[PDB]
Structure 1
Amino acid sequence: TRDQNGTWEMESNENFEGYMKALDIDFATRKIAVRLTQTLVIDQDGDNFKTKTTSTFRNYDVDFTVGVEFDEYTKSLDNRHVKALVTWEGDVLVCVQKGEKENRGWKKWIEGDKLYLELTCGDQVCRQVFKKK
């Protein structure tokens, strides 16, 4: 399925520390962030996505249209400018964030009632799994 609508509660989070370190997120922020349960709310209408990731400590909102390049300033993360593009490869939603960091982006897909999110930066891969609330 390409339908990723839902309120998604984080079930697991593998190597978030490595990914954040590759992004140059400071030590203290990384230590807080690795322990937190995230909720990812996705509102998807055709090719329009509105997403909100929340935790007790920090939130991050990003909206995008599939197939439309957009400028991103990663405020509240690593505070960089990237040129972002989100597209479909089969039923995998693929984001490439072009800029200073190599191999920067993510892949998101559904597999039997779980949402999988693989975040990449440099040589690091973070693997997250969510379940619908």
Structure 2
Amino acid sequence: AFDSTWKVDRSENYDKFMEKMGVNIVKRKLAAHDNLKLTITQEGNKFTVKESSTFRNIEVVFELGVTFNYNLADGTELRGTWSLEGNKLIGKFKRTDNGNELNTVREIIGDELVQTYVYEGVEAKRIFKKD
């Protein structure tokens, strides 16, 4: 289901994830602590995800199974699919420029949305409370 406004409390291991992408010592500090709010709205199969932070305020409009570019706000695109396994969004993604695969799991732990991004064995969790 997912449909709600979700402000970031914490961003766990996101600095080492952005080192394995390949960034300078600016985007590691700023994009881990950018104040990201996810307003998720599903109109008819398509999820309209309004992503508002210090870097960018944009709506990611995706149907379940469509291959799209997810942009990190640095110099890094991920091409792939958020698909719904019952109540969990399984993200089958890969890099445009490296070619390397990325598994990302969106799920609610009670009253907090975890987006669990695994790149090169390195797991990063951006954790958003209901707010």
The bucket for the TM-score relative to the shorter chain is: 0.7 to 0.9
1:88 to 75, 84, 89: 84
1: CA distance, partners of 2:16 / 2:59: 22
What count of residue pairs does the alignment treat as equivalent?
129
Question: CA distance change for structure 1 residues 75 and 20 in 2, over 3 Å: closer, same or farther?
Answer: closer
- Could you tell me the TM-score, scaled by structure 1's length? 0.80
Could you tell me which runs of 5 or more consecutive residues in structure 2 were left unpaired when the two chains were aligned: none
CA RMSD of aligned residues (A): 2.3
2:69 to 64, 69, 72: 72
Indicate the residue corresponding to 1:5 in structure 2. 3
2: CA distance, partners of 1:101 / 1:26: 21
Q: Pairwise mapping of residues 98-109 of structure 1 onto structure 2 (< 5 A)?
A: 98-99=94-95, 100-109=98-107
Indicate the residue corresponding to 1:34 in structure 2. 32
Contact 1:113–1:131 (8 Å) recurs in 2: yes
1: CA distance, partners of 2:87 / 2:27: 33
Could you tell me which runs of 5 or more consecutive residues in structure 1 were left unpaired when the two chains were aligned: none
Contact 1:60–1:76 (8 Å) recurs in 2: no
2: CA distance, partners of 1:73 / 1:108: 14
2: CA distance, partners of 1:32 / 1:45: 32
Q: Secondary structure at the match of 1:26?
A: coil
Identity percentage over the alignment?
Answer: 27
Indicate the residue corresponding to 1:122 in structure 2. 120
Q: Which has the higher contact order (CA 8 A, sep 6+)?
A: 1
2: CA distance, partners of 1:52 / 1:109: 17
